[PDB]
Amino acid sequence: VIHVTKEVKEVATLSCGYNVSVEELEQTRIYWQKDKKMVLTMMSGDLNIWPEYKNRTIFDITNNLSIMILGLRPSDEGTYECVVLKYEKGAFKREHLAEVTLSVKA
Amino acid sequence: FTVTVPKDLYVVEYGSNMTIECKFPVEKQLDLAALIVYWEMEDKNIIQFVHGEEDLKVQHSSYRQRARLLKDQLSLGNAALQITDVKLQDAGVYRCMISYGGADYKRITVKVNAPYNKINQRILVVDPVTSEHELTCQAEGYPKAEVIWTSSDHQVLSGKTTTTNSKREEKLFNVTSTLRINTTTNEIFYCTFRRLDPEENHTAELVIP
Ligand SMILES: *[C@@H]1O[C@H](CO[C@@H]2O[C@@H](C)[C@@H](O)[C@@H](O)[C@@H]2O)[C@@H](O)[C@H](O[C@@H]2O[C@H](CO)[C@@H](O)[C@H](O)[C@H]2NC(C)=O)[C@H]1NC(C)=O
Ligand SMILES: *[C@@H]1O[C@H](CO[C@@H]2O[C@@H](C)[C@@H](O)[C@@H](O)[C@@H]2O)[C@@H](O[C@@H]2O[C@H](CO)[C@@H](O)[C@H](O)[C@H]2NC(C)=O)[C@H](O)[C@H]1NC(C)=O
Ligand SMILES: *[C@@H]1O[C@H](CO)[C@@H](O)[C@H](O)[C@H]1NC(C)=O
Ligand SMILES: *[C@@H]1O[C@H](CO)[C@@H](O)[C@H](O)[C@H]1NC(C)=O
Ligand SMILES: *[C@@H]1O[C@H](CO)[C@@H](O)[C@H](O)[C@H]1NC(C)=O
């Protein structure tokens, strides 16, 4: 787990530590969540950002499946979890887990 | 929500006033409180505009007094970054990050061209008895350039060239060349500032009065 410290009104980029090629997207499922609450899902090429994260979050797929949070507020502070699932023969097996805690300070 | 750019590459003349733009959707009115715009260049912070509040303390020292976000354009769905008196240091990859009912970003590459366009010349009489004159050509540019002197009939003449760095910007060069020749009135001379790969030549015509 990475403990990142950022300042209020800044942008935080939290990395998944995993790069997926555009061809591999069709058979990969990406799950970013904060404090066990869903943030966004890249489901076999289909991105879905959750309503509390639509307005300020960017999903940089080409950059280590990172998420950018513009205009940090103390609310944004919390633990973030990124999950990767690659489909292989039967169904989707877990490939990667990324944990990163955001500390938004004055 | 999608951020768009008219040009993904800007090639700008050194000393110019450049405005790079990022467009984002706006419907009827602009809710200033819901708007976030950031402009950065690689590792340097340029603009931080969150919910209608711009912090100047966040802006990088190299951009102070020269960079500004045109807030009049925001109404039109245009985040326009204006940089006045563009330096060689401004060449690089810019990126705008915008949030207004969704978020997105776009990258702009800026290339700064510093030609030896503004050639300063001086013709002085050294000795009128022997009609000796001293001709000088001086220009600033990047990268280094050699100076070539030619007669009216295009034959090369030997001069003395001094190359130092510009005081205005450390990367920029200040090239000055001097030709001493016994010459008469109304004769034409040429000083050429040759820069290589890509080969580019800037010549000034000097007429002895
Ligand atoms: C480039 O822009 C220079 C700065 O302009 C001013 O400050 C900016 C940050 C921005 O707010 C501008 O809207 C504002 O005008 C400007 O000084 C420069 O020169 C202008 O052009 C003439 C001289 O070249 C002169 O007549 C103007 O008075 C002068 N502007 C000012 C304010 O002095 C501009 N140069 C070019 C090449 O466009
Ligand atoms: C997420 O943002 C939406 C976007 O609404 C607009 O956002 C800008 C483009 C700007 O023009 C605003 O004035 C708009 O409101 C928000 O949705 C609106 O919310 C207001 C109340 O806050 C409501 O009256 C509108 O009907 C909403 N419209 C729609 C279709 O959503 C929303 O509140 C934001 N949500 C979060 C979680 O921040
Ligand atoms: C991941 O790392 C860089 C870009 O982030 C790139 O050179 C590389 O090819 C990427 N890997 C994949 C699987 O695309
Ligand atoms: C350029 O060179 C000339 C000659 O040495 C010098 O007098 C002048 O001050 C220099 N200008 C700059 C901006 O470096
Ligand atoms: C040019 O001028 C000098 C005097 O300054 C004079 O001796 C002669 O006419 C010229 N010199 C040469 C070497 O041609």
Coordinates of C-alpha atoms and ligand atoms in Angstrom, one line a residue:
Chain A
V1 CA 0.0 0.0 0.0
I2 CA 1.2 3.5 -0.9
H3 CA 0.5 6.4 1.4
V4 CA 0.3 9.6 -0.7
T5 CA 0.0 13.0 0.7
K6 CA -1.6 15.8 -1.3
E7 CA -2.9 19.4 -0.7
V8 CA -6.4 20.8 -0.8
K9 CA -7.4 22.2 -4.2
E10 CA -4.7 20.0 -6.0
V11 CA -5.0 17.0 -8.3
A12 CA -4.3 13.5 -7.0
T13 CA -3.2 10.8 -9.3
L14 CA -3.5 7.3 -7.8
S15 CA -1.8 4.6 -9.8
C16 CA -2.9 1.0 -10.2
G17 CA 0.7 -0.2 -10.9
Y18 CA -0.5 -2.1 -14.0
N19 CA -0.5 -1.3 -17.7
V20 CA -3.1 -3.0 -20.0
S21 CA -2.8 -2.8 -23.8
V22 CA -5.9 -1.7 -25.8
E23 CA -6.2 -5.2 -27.3
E24 CA -6.2 -6.8 -23.7
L25 CA -9.1 -4.5 -22.7
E26 CA -11.8 -6.7 -24.3
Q27 CA -10.9 -9.5 -21.8
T28 CA -10.0 -7.5 -18.7
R29 CA -12.2 -6.1 -15.8
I30 CA -10.9 -3.0 -13.9
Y31 CA -12.4 -2.1 -10.5
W32 CA -11.5 1.2 -8.7
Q33 CA -13.2 1.7 -5.4
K34 CA -12.8 3.9 -2.3
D35 CA -13.5 2.7 1.2
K36 CA -15.3 -0.4 -0.2
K37 CA -17.6 2.0 -2.2
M38 CA -17.4 1.7 -6.0
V39 CA -15.7 4.5 -8.0
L40 CA -15.5 3.2 -11.6
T41 CA -15.6 0.0 -13.7
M42 CA -13.7 -0.7 -16.9
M43 CA -15.7 -3.8 -17.9
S44 CA -14.2 -5.3 -21.0
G45 CA -13.7 -1.9 -22.7
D46 CA -16.7 -0.3 -21.1
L47 CA -16.0 2.5 -18.6
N48 CA -18.6 3.4 -15.9
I49 CA -17.8 6.1 -13.4
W50 CA -20.1 6.2 -10.3
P51 CA -22.2 9.3 -9.7
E52 CA -20.2 10.6 -6.7
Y53 CA -17.1 10.4 -8.9
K54 CA -18.3 11.5 -12.4
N55 CA -17.8 15.2 -12.1
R56 CA -14.2 15.3 -10.8
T57 CA -12.5 12.0 -11.8
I58 CA -10.5 11.1 -14.9
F59 CA -9.5 7.6 -15.9
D60 CA -6.1 7.5 -17.6
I61 CA -6.2 4.0 -19.0
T62 CA -2.9 4.4 -20.9
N63 CA -1.1 5.5 -17.7
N64 CA -1.1 2.5 -15.3
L65 CA -4.9 2.6 -15.0
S66 CA -4.5 5.7 -12.9
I67 CA -7.3 7.9 -11.5
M68 CA -7.1 11.7 -11.3
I69 CA -9.1 13.6 -8.8
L70 CA -9.3 17.3 -9.7
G71 CA -9.9 19.9 -7.0
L72 CA -9.1 17.9 -3.9
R73 CA -11.4 18.5 -0.9
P74 CA -10.9 16.8 2.6
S75 CA -13.8 14.4 1.6
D76 CA -11.5 12.8 -1.1
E77 CA -9.2 11.5 1.7
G78 CA -9.5 7.8 2.1
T79 CA -8.2 4.3 1.0
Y80 CA -8.4 3.5 -2.7
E81 CA -8.3 0.0 -4.1
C82 CA -7.7 -1.0 -7.8
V83 CA -8.4 -4.6 -9.0
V84 CA -7.6 -6.3 -12.3
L85 CA -9.3 -9.4 -13.7
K86 CA -8.1 -11.1 -16.8
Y87 CA -10.5 -13.6 -18.5
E88 CA -8.6 -16.9 -19.1
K89 CA -10.2 -20.1 -20.6
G90 CA -13.1 -20.5 -18.0
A91 CA -13.9 -17.2 -16.3
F92 CA -12.1 -14.0 -14.8
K93 CA -9.2 -14.6 -12.5
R94 CA -7.7 -11.9 -10.2
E95 CA -4.5 -10.5 -11.7
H96 CA -3.6 -7.5 -9.6
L97 CA -4.5 -5.5 -6.5
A98 CA -3.4 -2.0 -5.7
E99 CA -3.9 -0.1 -2.5
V100 CA -3.2 3.6 -2.0
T101 CA -4.4 5.9 0.8
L102 CA -5.0 9.5 0.1
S103 CA -4.3 12.1 2.8
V104 CA -5.7 15.6 1.7
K105 CA -4.2 18.3 4.0
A106 CA -4.5 22.1 4.4
Chain B
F1 CA -17.7 15.0 -21.0
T2 CA -14.9 15.5 -23.5
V3 CA -12.1 18.1 -23.6
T4 CA -11.0 19.0 -27.2
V5 CA -8.1 21.0 -28.8
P6 CA -8.1 22.9 -32.1
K7 CA -4.4 22.4 -32.5
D8 CA -2.4 19.6 -30.7
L9 CA 0.9 21.3 -31.7
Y10 CA 1.9 25.0 -31.7
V11 CA 5.1 26.2 -33.3
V12 CA 5.8 29.7 -32.0
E13 CA 8.4 32.4 -32.7
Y14 CA 10.6 33.4 -29.8
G15 CA 9.4 36.7 -28.2
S16 CA 5.8 36.1 -29.5
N17 CA 2.5 36.1 -27.6
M18 CA 1.0 32.6 -27.7
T19 CA -2.4 31.4 -26.6
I20 CA -3.1 27.7 -26.4
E21 CA -6.7 26.6 -26.1
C22 CA -8.7 23.6 -24.6
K23 CA -12.4 23.5 -25.3
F24 CA -15.0 22.0 -23.0
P25 CA -18.9 21.9 -23.1
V26 CA -20.9 24.8 -21.7
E27 CA -24.7 25.0 -21.8
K28 CA -26.4 28.4 -21.8
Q29 CA -24.8 29.8 -18.6
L30 CA -21.4 29.1 -17.0
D31 CA -21.6 27.9 -13.4
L32 CA -18.3 29.3 -12.1
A33 CA -18.7 27.4 -8.8
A34 CA -18.6 24.0 -10.7
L35 CA -15.6 24.8 -12.8
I36 CA -12.0 23.5 -12.3
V37 CA -9.2 24.2 -14.8
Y38 CA -5.6 23.4 -14.4
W39 CA -2.8 24.2 -16.9
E40 CA 0.6 22.6 -16.4
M41 CA 3.7 22.0 -18.5
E42 CA 5.4 18.7 -17.7
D43 CA 6.5 19.2 -14.0
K44 CA 5.6 22.9 -13.7
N45 CA 2.3 24.3 -12.4
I46 CA 0.9 27.2 -14.5
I47 CA -2.8 27.7 -13.6
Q48 CA -5.0 26.5 -10.8
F49 CA -8.5 27.6 -11.1
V50 CA -10.9 25.8 -8.8
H51 CA -14.5 26.8 -8.4
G52 CA -13.9 30.3 -9.7
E53 CA -10.8 30.9 -7.4
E54 CA -7.4 31.3 -9.0
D55 CA -4.3 30.7 -6.8
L56 CA -1.3 32.6 -7.9
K57 CA 1.1 31.2 -5.2
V58 CA 0.8 27.8 -7.0
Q59 CA 2.2 29.2 -10.3
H60 CA 5.7 28.3 -11.2
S61 CA 8.3 31.1 -10.9
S62 CA 9.4 30.8 -14.6
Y63 CA 5.9 31.8 -15.7
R64 CA 5.2 34.7 -13.4
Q65 CA 4.3 38.0 -15.2
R66 CA 3.8 36.1 -18.5
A67 CA 1.1 33.5 -18.1
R68 CA -2.6 34.1 -17.6
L69 CA -5.9 32.2 -18.0
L70 CA -8.4 34.2 -20.1
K71 CA -11.5 34.0 -17.9
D72 CA -13.6 35.8 -20.6
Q73 CA -13.2 32.7 -22.8
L74 CA -14.4 30.3 -20.0
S75 CA -18.0 31.6 -20.7
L76 CA -17.6 30.3 -24.3
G77 CA -16.3 26.9 -23.2
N78 CA -12.7 27.8 -23.9
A79 CA -9.9 27.5 -21.3
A80 CA -7.3 29.7 -23.0
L81 CA -3.8 30.0 -21.6
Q82 CA -2.0 33.1 -22.8
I83 CA 1.8 33.3 -22.5
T84 CA 3.3 36.7 -23.5
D85 CA 6.9 37.1 -24.5
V86 CA 7.5 33.4 -25.2
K87 CA 10.9 32.0 -24.2
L88 CA 12.8 28.9 -25.4
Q89 CA 12.0 27.6 -21.9
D90 CA 8.3 27.5 -22.9
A91 CA 8.9 24.7 -25.4
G92 CA 7.4 21.5 -24.0
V93 CA 4.3 19.4 -23.4
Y94 CA 1.4 21.4 -21.9
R95 CA -1.7 19.8 -20.4
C96 CA -5.1 21.1 -19.4
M97 CA -7.3 19.3 -16.9
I98 CA -10.8 20.4 -16.8
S99 CA -13.8 19.5 -14.6
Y100 CA -17.3 20.9 -15.3
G101 CA -20.0 18.3 -15.1
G102 CA -17.4 15.6 -15.7
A103 CA -13.6 15.6 -16.2
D104 CA -11.1 15.2 -19.0
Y105 CA -7.6 16.3 -20.1
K106 CA -5.7 17.1 -23.3
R107 CA -2.0 17.5 -24.1
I108 CA -0.5 20.2 -26.4
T109 CA 3.1 20.2 -27.6
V110 CA 4.7 23.6 -28.0
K111 CA 7.9 24.2 -30.1
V112 CA 9.7 27.5 -29.8
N113 CA 11.6 28.8 -32.8
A114 CA 14.5 31.3 -32.2
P115 CA 15.7 32.5 -35.6
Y116 CA 18.4 35.1 -36.2
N117 CA 15.6 37.3 -37.7
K118 CA 16.4 40.6 -36.0
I119 CA 19.9 41.5 -37.3
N120 CA 21.4 44.7 -36.0
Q121 CA 23.9 46.4 -38.2
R122 CA 26.5 49.1 -37.9
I123 CA 28.7 50.7 -40.5
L124 CA 31.6 52.8 -39.3
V125 CA 34.4 54.7 -41.0
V126 CA 37.7 53.6 -39.4
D127 CA 40.0 55.8 -41.6
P128 CA 38.7 58.0 -44.4
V129 CA 42.1 58.6 -45.9
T130 CA 42.3 54.8 -46.8
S131 CA 38.5 54.4 -46.9
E132 CA 38.7 51.6 -44.3
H133 CA 35.3 50.7 -42.9
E134 CA 34.2 48.4 -40.0
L135 CA 30.9 46.5 -40.6
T136 CA 29.1 44.8 -37.8
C137 CA 26.2 42.3 -37.7
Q138 CA 24.6 41.1 -34.5
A139 CA 21.7 38.8 -33.9
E140 CA 20.4 36.4 -31.2
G141 CA 19.0 33.0 -31.9
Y142 CA 19.2 29.3 -31.2
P143 CA 21.1 27.1 -31.8
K144 CA 24.6 28.6 -32.6
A145 CA 25.0 30.2 -36.0
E146 CA 28.1 31.1 -38.0
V147 CA 28.4 34.5 -39.8
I148 CA 29.4 34.6 -43.4
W149 CA 30.4 37.8 -45.1
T150 CA 29.9 38.3 -48.9
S151 CA 30.9 41.1 -51.3
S152 CA 28.5 42.7 -53.9
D153 CA 29.6 39.9 -56.3
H154 CA 29.0 37.1 -53.7
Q155 CA 32.6 36.3 -52.9
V156 CA 33.3 35.4 -49.2
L157 CA 35.2 37.9 -47.0
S158 CA 37.0 37.2 -43.7
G159 CA 35.4 38.5 -40.5
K160 CA 35.7 38.1 -36.7
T161 CA 32.8 36.3 -35.0
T162 CA 32.1 36.2 -31.3
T163 CA 29.5 33.8 -29.9
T164 CA 28.3 34.2 -26.3
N165 CA 25.1 33.3 -24.5
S166 CA 22.3 35.9 -24.4
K167 CA 21.7 37.8 -21.2
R168 CA 17.9 37.7 -21.7
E169 CA 17.8 33.9 -21.7
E170 CA 20.7 31.6 -20.8
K171 CA 19.9 29.0 -23.6
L172 CA 19.8 31.7 -26.4
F173 CA 23.0 32.8 -28.2
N174 CA 24.2 36.3 -29.0
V175 CA 26.3 36.2 -32.2
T176 CA 28.3 39.3 -33.4
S177 CA 30.6 39.5 -36.4
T178 CA 32.8 42.3 -37.6
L179 CA 34.3 42.8 -41.1
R180 CA 37.0 45.3 -41.8
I181 CA 37.4 46.3 -45.4
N182 CA 38.7 49.2 -47.5
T183 CA 35.5 50.0 -49.4
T184 CA 33.9 52.9 -51.3
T185 CA 30.4 54.5 -51.2
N186 CA 27.1 52.8 -52.3
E187 CA 28.8 49.3 -52.3
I188 CA 26.6 46.4 -51.1
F189 CA 27.6 43.8 -48.5
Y190 CA 25.9 40.8 -47.0
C191 CA 26.2 39.1 -43.6
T192 CA 24.6 35.7 -43.4
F193 CA 23.7 33.9 -40.1
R194 CA 24.0 30.2 -41.1
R195 CA 22.4 27.5 -38.7
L196 CA 22.5 23.8 -39.7
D197 CA 20.2 20.6 -39.8
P198 CA 17.7 22.0 -40.6
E199 CA 19.7 24.5 -42.7
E200 CA 18.4 28.1 -42.4
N201 CA 20.0 31.3 -43.5
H202 CA 19.3 34.9 -42.5
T203 CA 21.0 37.6 -44.5
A204 CA 21.2 41.4 -44.0
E205 CA 22.1 43.8 -46.7
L206 CA 24.5 46.6 -45.7
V207 CA 25.0 49.7 -47.9
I208 CA 28.0 52.1 -47.3
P209 CA 26.8 55.7 -47.3
Ligands
LIG1 C1 2.3 40.9 -26.3 O1 1.6 41.1 -25.1 C2 2.3 42.1 -24.2 C3 1.5 42.1 -22.9 O2 0.2 42.6 -23.1 C4 -0.5 42.9 -22.0 O3 -0.3 42.0 -20.9 C5 -0.7 40.6 -21.1 C6 -0.4 39.8 -20.0 C7 -2.2 40.6 -21.5 O4 -3.0 41.0 -20.4 C8 -2.5 41.6 -22.7 O5 -3.9 41.5 -23.0 C9 -2.0 43.0 -22.4 O6 -2.2 43.8 -23.5 C10 2.3 43.4 -24.9 O7 3.0 44.4 -24.1 C11 3.0 43.3 -26.3 O8 3.1 44.6 -26.9 C12 1.9 45.4 -27.2 O9 2.0 45.8 -28.6 C13 2.7 47.1 -28.9 C14 4.2 46.9 -28.8 O10 4.6 45.7 -29.5 C15 2.1 48.2 -28.1 O11 1.5 49.2 -28.9 C16 1.2 47.8 -26.9 O12 0.9 48.8 -26.0 C17 1.7 46.5 -26.2 N1 0.9 46.2 -25.1 C18 1.1 46.7 -23.9 C19 0.0 46.4 -22.9 O13 2.0 47.5 -23.6 C20 2.4 42.2 -27.1 N2 3.3 42.0 -28.3 C21 2.9 41.3 -29.4 C22 4.0 41.0 -30.4 O14 1.7 41.0 -29.6
LIG2 C1 -22.4 16.5 -10.8 O1 -22.5 17.6 -11.7 C2 -23.9 17.7 -12.2 C3 -23.8 18.7 -13.4 O2 -24.8 19.7 -13.4 C4 -24.3 20.9 -14.0 O3 -22.9 21.0 -13.9 C5 -22.3 22.1 -14.6 C6 -22.1 21.6 -16.0 C7 -23.0 23.4 -14.3 O4 -23.7 23.9 -15.5 C8 -24.0 23.3 -13.2 O5 -24.7 24.5 -13.0 C9 -25.0 22.1 -13.5 O6 -25.8 21.9 -12.3 C10 -24.8 18.2 -11.0 O7 -26.1 18.0 -11.5 C11 -27.1 19.1 -11.3 O8 -27.2 19.4 -9.9 C12 -28.1 20.5 -9.6 C13 -28.1 20.6 -8.0 O9 -26.8 20.7 -7.5 C14 -29.5 20.2 -10.1 O10 -30.3 21.3 -9.9 C15 -29.4 19.8 -11.6 O11 -30.7 19.4 -12.1 C16 -28.4 18.6 -11.8 N1 -28.4 18.2 -13.2 C17 -28.1 17.0 -13.6 C18 -28.7 16.5 -14.9 O12 -27.3 16.2 -12.9 C19 -24.6 17.3 -9.8 O13 -25.2 17.9 -8.7 C20 -23.2 17.0 -9.5 N2 -23.1 15.8 -8.6 C21 -22.1 15.7 -7.7 C22 -22.1 14.3 -7.0 O14 -21.2 16.5 -7.5
LIG3 C1 3.0 0.4 -19.9 O1 4.1 1.3 -19.7 C2 4.4 2.2 -20.8 C3 3.4 3.3 -20.7 O2 2.8 3.6 -19.4 C4 4.5 1.5 -22.2 O3 5.7 1.8 -22.8 C5 4.2 0.0 -22.1 O4 4.2 -0.5 -23.4 C6 2.9 -0.2 -21.3 N1 2.5 -1.6 -21.4 C7 1.5 -2.1 -22.1 C8 1.1 -3.5 -21.7 O5 0.9 -1.5 -22.9
LIG4 C1 24.8 40.9 -27.3 O1 26.1 41.2 -27.7 C2 26.6 42.6 -27.7 C3 28.0 42.6 -28.2 O2 28.8 41.8 -27.2 C4 26.3 43.2 -26.4 O3 26.8 44.5 -26.3 C5 24.9 43.1 -26.0 O4 24.7 43.7 -24.7 C6 24.4 41.6 -26.0 N1 23.0 41.5 -25.7 C7 22.5 40.5 -25.0 C8 21.0 40.6 -24.8 O5 23.1 39.6 -24.6
LIG5 C1 43.5 48.7 -46.6 O1 43.8 49.8 -45.8 C2 45.2 50.0 -45.4 C3 45.2 51.1 -44.3 O2 44.3 50.9 -43.3 C4 46.1 50.2 -46.6 O3 47.4 49.9 -46.2 C5 45.7 49.4 -47.8 O4 45.3 50.2 -48.8 C6 44.7 48.2 -47.5 N1 45.4 47.1 -47.0 C7 45.6 45.9 -47.6 C8 46.4 44.9 -47.0 O5 45.0 45.7 -48.7

